[PDB]
Design a protein around this nucleic acid. Structure first.
Lengths: 25, 64, 126, 215, 136, 84, 99
RNA sequence: CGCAAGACGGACCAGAGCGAAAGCAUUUGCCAAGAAUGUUUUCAUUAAUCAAGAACGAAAGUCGGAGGUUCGAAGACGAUCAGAUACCGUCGUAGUUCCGACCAUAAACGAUGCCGACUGGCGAUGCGGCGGCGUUAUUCCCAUGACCCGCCGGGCAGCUUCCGGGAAACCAAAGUCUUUGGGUUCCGGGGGGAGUAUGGUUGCAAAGCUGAAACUUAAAGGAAUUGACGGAAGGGCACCACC
């Protein structure tokens, strides 16, 4: 199911990027 | 506990069975009661009207 | 094993019987001599095989038709089932019954007057 | 228990049926003979037997089963009474088939005696002898009208009778035959049975009424 | 031993319960009410490896061991009740079912009526193994 | 239908077979009839697809019952159509 | 490309249809996709019947039938040889096998 | 043999019915709603399709109460194996059931907007109406139910054909198109980067909606044909195969 897993991989990367940037200011 | 030997006569040959065709499948009629007939598997060369010696009469087998 | 006969044997045997039916019979040793004088056959071993199937076909032709072979003796009795049979001296006669709706169809066509009549069942048969 | 031959301590008893059935002997059963604070009759009472009608009645069909209970012990005899009835598994599996409607009903009722019973009834639609169509379905309001007639006939027969007259109707099953006659004006039916009976509650023990069913 | 004291012209009946599945088979004979046990024998008592416990042969040997104990205790005829596992599971009898029945006939017990007794739900709790099934 | 049947002259058995709105010119299937009963004999007029439970001038309990199609008469002496 | 006109299912004129669990593996599939087999057989085999009729207590008795209804998914029905694959024109035949 | 609790409605069950879709199967009663048909009833253009705005919306998931039978993410162990944080087995938390608030997604599929007209044949099937010779049931007719033979509406579908269309597979519509115009809503423009970054907005959270560019590349893709190949199926053969 590679497209469903590429979608899951992007969601966890975006959750990391969310928490990293919103801490800065 | 113990049971006796039985003798039976071959009335028809039905085909060959086992992984390499090793055993003949055969119909036998008991010589103490002409009405009683069953099917068996035999290891060697067999011909119609041969007599088999059975160590148990009550067991019966289909296609191994 | 295999004893099936090839088309070179089966075709030569049919052509011999079409031309020489009146010479042939059930004795293989006489058929073997006839087939040597009416035909050029290159080998003794091929001559024996042709006379063998000719001998098989003669014993079939004594019972009924063989679809690939024809002879005058069998065609002239076909021509006697052709033409007219000994069965009857007149047709099956026109005195036959009529149903009420055929009587009405003939009435509109200005005809009738020579047929008996009866009705069918009260409702359609199931 | 690790007794040496416990079958040396067992007494055989006979089992006797109610006086309606044309064959009155059920069979034989085991109990351990009496010891201090453990009497044999207390082990024999309340046991259930299930019997084919063809072994109780001489001319009957084998596919109805009756249940009987032991109530008291007299000498070497155990005396029994009615507890319910049922159809054999292979009968019911042979009736349910495609392209038909199946109709079912149930009621709770009392006899003139104190017994409370629960009854179940089944029927199936009939393929007419001229029919060229493949299916014999009833519409929902025809099914509702038939089910009310099943309950109406099935309650009428129990309310005004005792358990003696109730079991005399169940042996030939005249109940199912009367339902099958009445419904033919709504939709024809081809198999119709009272398929099960359960007993819910019963009166006091009453030895005189027990013996009236045995004399 | 002691059966009923009548021993001529008529039969004494028991009930035989045969529970035949995959993995094993039971042969178990009882009193006519079902409450007292007379004897019980199983496929795993006759063989000495787990593959063979559901076999036709083990079931024949268990039935012959039961029928001798019946005649020794004075029973002469049997009613038969047959089970497969039932409930959520397969409800077809296991391979040893056919062999036990003929083996108690051939060893001299008289045969009464026979019944199928496997338990069937009108509807049921959720079956084991998940949505994708057991995968092989 | 063949390739060449003319559309201006349908036979009456071709016209009577089809739906009331799909004829060449429209016409109803319903009609008026005159109806009469026992005990009191004043004749009355009824419509064949009536929705009303009709009571006659003779004051009888029901002349006809309504239904999902044609109404049904209570075994009255006439079902005769009026001609026009 | 589309393989079957019916999508391999009976559903026409409906949204949802209830599932069932298979008799071999307990996989979950629709009631109208599942492959059906209703089996009726004797309790006693054609070889064994003579031995069980002669030991019977009754002068007349008829041995009972066993009734079972079975459901398969496509993978179990193919692996257990209940169904075979077919030629592109032969797939259209809806009549059951001959007797 | 008997008691208790929680979940579920088998067989009958079908290319059958109902609903805007998601969905909907034990009995009986109560409340409000609806399609088609029948009609020589009534109003008389009141209609079609839709930015903004609005109701409903499988499963999983979140918050607050109650319950807990079966099954079972995470987790603890037994096997298998080079390893096995998997497939197979034993146990089990959250959840799976009910009540009250949230959430707005799906291969949410006929991968196929809605309204209207026209263009071949045939047999069935569910609902309402119309006509007809018999058989069967209730009361003694009549009426009415189960069956049988036709006709008309509108419904879920099937078979067939050189209607015609298409790249073909196939389609009575996916037809009436270079012989190109019945009305009207949404929406695509070679393959990637990418449903990503950034701003706005809704949410308790998970997340939903809207949504780029720099840069990179000669093909990526659809339908069908002949080979080769399969730990796919069916027939047949060989001591350079086996018994």
């Amino acid at each position: 199911m590679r497209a469903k897993w590429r979608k899951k991989r992007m969601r966890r990367l975006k959750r990391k990027r969310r928490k990293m940037r919103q801490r800065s200011k | 506990r113990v049971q006796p030997i039985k003798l039976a006569r071959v009335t028809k040959v039905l085909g060959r069975t086992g992984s390499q065709g090793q055993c003949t499948q055969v119909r036998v009629e008991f010589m103490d009661d002409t009405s009683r007939s069953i099917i068996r598997n035999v290891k060697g060369p067999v011909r119609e009207g041969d007599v088999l010696t059975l160590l148990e009469s009550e067991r019966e087998a289909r296609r191994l | 094993m295999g004893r099936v006969r090839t088309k070179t044997v089966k075709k030569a045997a049919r052509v011999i019987i079409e031309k020489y039916y009146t010479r042939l019979g059930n004795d293989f040793h006489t058929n073997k001599r006839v087939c040597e004088e009416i035909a050029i056959i290159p080998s003794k071993k091929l001559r024996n095989k042709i006379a063998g199937y000719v001998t098989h076909l003669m014993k079939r032709i004594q019972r009924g038709p063989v679809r690939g072979i024809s002879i005058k003796l069998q065609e002239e009795e076909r021509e006697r089932r052709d033409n007219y049979v000994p069965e009857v001296s007149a047709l099956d006669q026109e005195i036959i019954e009529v149903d009420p709706d055929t009587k009405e169809m003939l009435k509109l066509l200005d005809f009738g007057s020579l047929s008996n009549l009866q009705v069918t069942q009260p409702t359609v048969g199931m | 228990k690790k007794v040496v031959d416990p079958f040396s301590k067992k007494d055989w008893y006979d089992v006797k049926a109610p006086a309606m059935f044309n064959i009155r002997n059920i069979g034989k059963t085991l109990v351990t003979r009496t010891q201090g604070t453990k009497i044999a009759s207390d082990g024999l009472k309340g046991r259930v037997f299930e019997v084919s009608l063809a072994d109780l009645q001489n001319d009957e069909v084998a596919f109805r089963k009756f249940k009987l209970i032991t109530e008291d012990v007299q000498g070497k005899n155990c005396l029994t009474n009615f507890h319910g009835m049922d159809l054999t598994r292979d009968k019911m599996c042979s009736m349910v088939k495609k392209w038909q409607t199946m109709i079912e009903a149930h009621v709770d009722v009392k006899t003139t005696d104190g017994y409370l019973l629960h009854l179940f009834c089944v029927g199936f639609t009939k393929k007419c002898n001229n029919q060229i169509r493949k299916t014999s379905y009833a519409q929902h309001q025809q099914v509702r009208q038939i089910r009310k007639k099943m309950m109406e006939i099935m309650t009428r027969e129990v309310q005004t009778n005792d358990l003696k007259e109730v079991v005399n109707k169940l042996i030939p099953d005249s109940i199912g035959k009367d339902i099958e006659k009445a419904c033919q004006s709504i939709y024809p039916l081809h198999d119709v049975f009272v398929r099960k009976v359960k007993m819910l509650k019963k009166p006091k023990f009453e030895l005189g009424k027990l013996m009236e069913l045995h004399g | 031993s002691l059966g009923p004291q009548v021993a001529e012209g008529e039969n004494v009946f028991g009930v035989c319960h045969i529970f035949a599945s995959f993995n094993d088979t039971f042969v178990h004979v009882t009193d006519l009410s079902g409450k007292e046990t007379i004897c019980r024998v199983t496929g795993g008592m006759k063989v000495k490896a787990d593959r063979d416990e559901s076999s036709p042969y083990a079931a024949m040997l268990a039935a012959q061991d039961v029928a001798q104990r019946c005649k020794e205790l004075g029973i002469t005829a049997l009613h038969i009740k047959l089970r497969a596992t039932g409930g959520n599971r397969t409800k077809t009898p296991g391979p040893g079912a056919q062999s036990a029945l003929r083996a108690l006939a051939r060893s001299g017990m008289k045969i009464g009526r026979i019944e199928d007794v496997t338990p069937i739900p009108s509807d049921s709790t959720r079956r084991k193994g998940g949505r994708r099934g057991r995968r092989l | 239908m063949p390739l060449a049947k003319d559309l201006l002259h349908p036979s009456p058995e071709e016209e009577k077979r089809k739906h009331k709105k799909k004829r060449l010119v429209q016409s109803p299937n319903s009609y008026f009839m005159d109806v009469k009963c026992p005990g009191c004999y004043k004749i009355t007029t009824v419509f064949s697809h009536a929705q009303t439970v009709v009571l006659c001038v003779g004051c009888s309990t029901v002349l006809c019952q309504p239904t999902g199609g044609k109404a049904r008469l209570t075994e009255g002496c006439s079902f005769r159509r009026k001609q026009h | 490309t589309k393989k079957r006109r019916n999508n391999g299912r009976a559903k026409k004129g409906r949204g949802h249809v209830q599932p069932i669990r298979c008799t071999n593996c307990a996989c979950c599939v629709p009631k109208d996709k599942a492959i059906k087999k209703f089996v009726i057989r004797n309790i006693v085999e054609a070889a064994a019947v003579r031995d069980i009729s002669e030991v019977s207590v009754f002068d007349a008795y008829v041995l009972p039938k066993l009734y079972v209804k079975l459901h398969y998914c496509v993978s179990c029905a193919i692996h257990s040889k209940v169904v075979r694959n077919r030629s592109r024109e032969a797939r259209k035949d809806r009549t059951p096998p001959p007797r």
